[PDB]
Write a protein that binds this ligand. Structure first.
Ligand SMILES: [Zn+2]
Lengths: 81, 216, 63, 97, 128
RNA sequence: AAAGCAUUUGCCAAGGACGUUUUCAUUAAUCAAGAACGAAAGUUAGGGGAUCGAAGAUGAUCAGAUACCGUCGUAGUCUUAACCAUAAACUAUGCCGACUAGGGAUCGGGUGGUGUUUUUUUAAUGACCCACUCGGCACCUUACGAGAAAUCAAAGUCUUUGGGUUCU
């Protein structure tokens, strides 16, 4: 206070700030690589997805939309890429 | 110049077999005279007695039963279930501030043709580590709670008569049955069925009343 | 004449607009456990006996 | 000048609250205003609790209570002394006694 | 338990007190005496002293016909009126106990609406 | 949006906030003229039967009482159909935008927790707890600042006087 480094705020403060209130705004969402139990193909899923995403094969369910992050269904291994 | 007290009898009020203390009390009726009977001046009476007096336990000191006189035989008069009500002591004591009052009612008839309206009441509660001081329920919880209560109150009456309904309003079966169906929606303390009401009655059918009586 | 006696246990305090009425608590001196609160006209000290023409009113303070 | 920042009692964000009636006079006063007390009393007084113990069937069962919420006008509550005037500094204190 | 039960319906308004005994059903009243028949002063009709004198005369009548024990239901005027029981309600209830009757299952039965019809005074009140 | 709106249940359209690595790309702000919506309260033609008081009927009180108090009662917040649109229509504080201070609560959404509880053994949600955040109705303490003061986190950033715009 009254002397601060406004060019280099600590990473904790930037992490606890809102998405648009950082020094440079940017998304807090990410993309996920999920493995449905049925087949073994690569499916990329948005973390805050709004559509009920299904695989190209056997098209069951991969996530259900929510008002926040998409709820990934019962057990399907997920990576974050 | 008449002294009308020394012209009346005394009749012994008798409760149905669904209760255990079947001796309620005594009442007065005038004598039977020319085209004026004592039975027709007696067949309409409704007696209000605390349910703790019929069962003897003090766990039921806050409920009451209307008993409608239906038939008179041998200087005792036989009653039938006319309605359950809930005393003004406890209903006005459950409604504290800083909570949500949830009420439901359904109009539904039994397997025999007794059309009834059943009233239920339930309150929210702070849950065992709560710091905030009011514990209100969102108004989508309250609508979902009423849907379960009305669903239970309907199904439970379809498969019973007042011979069986009055046997299940005593041991608080309904209250626990509401609770374990609505404990995953909101904590919901103090569930009661506070009032049932008789809407319509069928023909008299003396045999059902006599089968209900006739012991002791 | 159903005259019942009593004796003052504690003098509560004066009452009335002019303050000429003293409020006292009395023990019935036939049954000790009964204590009624009434108000007297003259001067009362502690532990003196009274006479009650009828012991039912349990009167409150006057204004 | 303005006397309280609440202007009275708590509306602050509504525009309109439906009124109630005083219990002494029945003046129509809004529900956000209209001083409220809750009178919880035993049905038998403190002098008759001893009296109705021996005259009771159902020994030591209970005593039921009278529950009654009272709404008061501003004028009637000052007159009935449930509320009295207080100093300019003491007016800001929102605590029960 | 050879007690015989009646029901004393006590109505304590601020103008008068009613002490009224029926049987278990509300028909066939045993004895009804008001606060106003024990004093012709027209302002002591609601006094506690005139209320308890009524209960002295009820229990005398209940002793003659043979009612020994009593359920009591006490009420105010109610409705859109005060909902507060009058000053005579306590004195008459205590006087039944001292008179020798038995008491059980007390309940306050004051009529209370579910927010119904308009009240005395017209928006500015009974103003004095 | 305001006037306003509180127990059900189903229909019919609407809406803010939040989330979003969606889409368009200046489409915006305030607005003469012109419009929509408006507490109540009597323009105006079924029904249902008064608790209130104009007045009126009346009974008191009073010097008088045409008032307050008491009893009753027609027009008079219930039709289906308009007010021309008036209120202490009030936060007596136009609307949009930016900045300046510390706190603890709460409503709605969201994020996180090798948290609690509900039972199937924990699980899944729900309810709760802790921390953060966006957006609200507010509040508490101060006064760098303002004010004639009362007081005000805006009524501050104002003789060191200019962010935009409407009305008086
Ligand atoms: Zn698949």
């Amino acid at each position: 206070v009254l002397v601060q480094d406004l060019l280099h705020p600590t990473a904790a403060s930037e992490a606890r700030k809102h998405k648009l209130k950082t020094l440079v705004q940017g998304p807090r969402s990410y993309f996920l690589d999920v493995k449905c139990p049925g087949c073994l193909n690569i499916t990329t899923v948005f973390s805050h997805a709004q559509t009920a995403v299904t695989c190209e094969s056997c098209s069951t369910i991969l996530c259900t939309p929510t008002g926040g992050k998409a709820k990934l269904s019962e057990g399907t291994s997920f990576r974050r890429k | 110049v008449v002294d009308p007290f020394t012209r009346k009898e005394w009749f012994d009020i008798k409760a149905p077999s669904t209760f255990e203390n079947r001796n309620v009390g005594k009442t007065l009726v005038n004598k039977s005279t020319g085209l004026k009977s004592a039975s027709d001046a007696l067949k309409g009476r409704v007696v209000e007695v605390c349910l703790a007096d019929l069962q003897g336990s003090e766990d039921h000191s806050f409920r009451k039963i209307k008993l409608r006189v239906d038939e008179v035989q041998g200087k005792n008069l036989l009653t039938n279930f006319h309605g359950m009500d809930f005393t003004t002591d406890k209903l006005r004591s459950m409604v504290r501030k800083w909570q949500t009052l949830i009420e439901a009612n359904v109009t539904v008839k039994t397997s025999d043709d007794y059309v009834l309206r059943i009233f239920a009441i339930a309150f929210t509660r702070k849950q065992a580590n709560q710091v905030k001081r009011h514990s209100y329920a969102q108004s989508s919880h309250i609508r979902a709670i009423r849907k379960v209560i009305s669903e239970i109150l309907t199904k439970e009456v379809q498969g019973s008569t007042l011979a069986q309904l009055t046997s299940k309003l005593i041991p608080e079966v309904i209250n626990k049955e509401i609770e374990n169906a609505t404990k995953d929606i909101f904590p919901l303390q103090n569930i009661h069925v506070r009032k049932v009401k008789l809407l319509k009655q069928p023909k008299f059918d003396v045999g059902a009343l006599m089968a209900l009586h006739g012991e002791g | 004449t159903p005259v019942t006696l009593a004796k003052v246990i504690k003098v509560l305090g004066r009452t009335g607009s002019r303050g000429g009425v003293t409020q006292v608590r009395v023990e019935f001196l036939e049954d000790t456990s009964r204590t009624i609160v009434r108000n007297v006209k003259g001067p009362v000290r502690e532990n003196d006996i009274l006479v009650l023409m009828e012991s039912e009113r349990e009167a409150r303070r006057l204004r | 000048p303005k006397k309280r920042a609440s202007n009275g009692r708590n509306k602050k964000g509504r525009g309109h609250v439906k009124p109630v009636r005083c219990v002494n006079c029945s003046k129509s006063i809004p529900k956000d205003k209209a001083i409220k007390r809750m009178a919880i009393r035993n049905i038998v007084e403190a002098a008759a609790v001893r009296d109705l113990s021996e005259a009771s069937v159902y020994p030591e069962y209970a005593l039921p209570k009278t529950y009654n919420k009272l709404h008061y006008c501003v004028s009637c509550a000052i007159h009935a002394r449930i509320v009295r005037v207080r100093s300019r500094e003491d007016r800001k204190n929102r605590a029960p006694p | 338990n050879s007690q015989v039960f009646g029901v004393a319906r006590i109505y304590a308004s601020f103008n008068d007190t009613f002490v009224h005994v029926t049987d278990l059903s509300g028909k066939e009243t045993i004895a009804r005496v008001t606060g106003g028949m024990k004093v012709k002063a027209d302002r002591d009709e609601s006094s506690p002293y005139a209320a308890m004198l009524a209960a002295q005369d009820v229990a005398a009548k209940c002793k003659e016909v043979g009612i020994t024990a009593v359920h009591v239901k006490i009420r105010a005027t109610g409705g859109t009126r005060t909902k507060t029981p009058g000053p005579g309600g306590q004195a008459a209830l205590r006087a039944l106990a001292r008179s020798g009757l038995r008491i059980g299952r007390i309940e306050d039965v004051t009529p209370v609406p579910s927010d119904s019809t308009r009240k005395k005074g017209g928006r500015r009140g009974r103003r004095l």
